[PDB]
């Protein structure tokens, strides 16, 4: 109510990339499945089959370091990595609702 600041975390770049976001994911594990399910709805349906196909090719868009972080995030959250990759690439897909166009 009165203290509405975002929770603070330290991401140690000295740790292996697959372990860096463990605490962040563990603390918000309750909300993650609903966020994913609700974010996907903002992707235009005709392009959803393509996004999931392209998102599995994780090695093509990110450095090895970022690949391991995304894989670690998918492992800790228990959510499919292709969806996590897709949301990170389509950073603004749920920011501005454009479904009325389709």
């Amino acid at each position: 109510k009165l203290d509405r600041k975002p929770r603070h975390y330290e991401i140690n770049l000295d740790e292996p990339p697959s372990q860096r976001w463990n605490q962040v994911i563990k603390d918000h594990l309750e909300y993650l499945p609903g966020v994913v399910e609700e974010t996907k709805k903002y992707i235009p349906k005709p392009l959803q089959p393509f996004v999931w196909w392209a998102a599995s090719k994780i090695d093509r868009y990110f450095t090895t370091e970022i690949q391991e972080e995304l894989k670690g995030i998918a492992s800790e959250s228990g959510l499919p990595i292709g969806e996590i990759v897709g949301m990170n690439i389509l950073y603004d897909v749920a920011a501005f609702d454009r479904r009325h166009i389709f």
Binding site: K1, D14, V35, F62, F96
Partner: protein
């Protein structure tokens, strides 16, 4: 999204940022502030969300701060394939984070954001520490960039940008209100608390606003300030 950069009479540069997100209430529960540390030293900080390891609102403490606004033009049907293509070709949030990690000075960061290469259309707002070190970088369709810096001697002491261009930009109530409010408060004695008043004015703050944040990279304790300056709106 509303990003503001202002330099007061004393030379201090303030970076204000509102994040508007259609999926408003769900995102508030996973908004976090992050310090990226290496060898016990903060390399850079940022705001992000659980599941997202890129940075769209961040700071290189003592050197510069950056925020990215999505840029929406007409003909979304005509260009959707090209929009998706550039987003995959150069992931935006990780490009920003890479700049925060490998570019040490305001001037270095501005040039990195200005390189002629495929980049998703957007506005990159960068704030520095020296004079006139405040710029809006316009990433155009689909590889060019334009810069619009501060000109305090021409009485251009602030920059405001949202999500649109052309008619829709000039009619954006968020952008119009913020410009009016900055003029009311005036350049002199404009500080971070002045930025809070601007960012909290309706409709700069609105039903879709997830958080409001202020960044002053020039502060001797900029990291400490940024760690407590963000407000998740009710």
């Amino acid at each position: 999204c509303t990003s503001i950069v202002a330099q007061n009479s004393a030379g201090q540069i303030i970076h204000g940022r509102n994040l508007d997100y259609d999926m408003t209430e769900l995102l508030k529960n996973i908004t976090i502030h992050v310090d990226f540390v290496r060898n016990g030293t903060i390399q850079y900080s940022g705001l992000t969300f659980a599941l997202y390891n890129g940075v769209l609102t961040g700071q290189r403490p003592g050197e510069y701060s950056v925020s990215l606004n999505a840029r929406y033009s007409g003909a979304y049907i005509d260009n959707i394939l090209m929009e998706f293509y550039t987003k995959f070709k150069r992931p935006v949030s990780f490009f920003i984070r890479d700049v925060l990690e490998n570019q040490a000075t305001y001037t270095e960061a501005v040039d990195a954001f200005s390189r002629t290469h495929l980049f998703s259309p957007s506005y990159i707002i960068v704030a520095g520490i020296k004079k006139n070190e405040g710029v809006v970088i316009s990433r155009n369709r689909w590889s060019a960039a334009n810069v619009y810096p501060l000109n305090v001697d021409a009485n251009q002491w602030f920059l405001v940008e949202t999500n649109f261009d052309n008619w829709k930009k000039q009619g954006d109530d968020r952008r119009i209100t913020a410009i009016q409010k900055l003029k009311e408060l005036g350049r002199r004695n404009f500080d971070e608390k002045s930025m809070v008043e601007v960012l909290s004015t309706v409709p700069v703050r609105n039903n879709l606003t997830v958080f409001s944040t202020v960044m002053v990279p020039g502060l001797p304790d900029s990291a400490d300030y940024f760690r407590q300056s963000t407000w998740i709106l009710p």
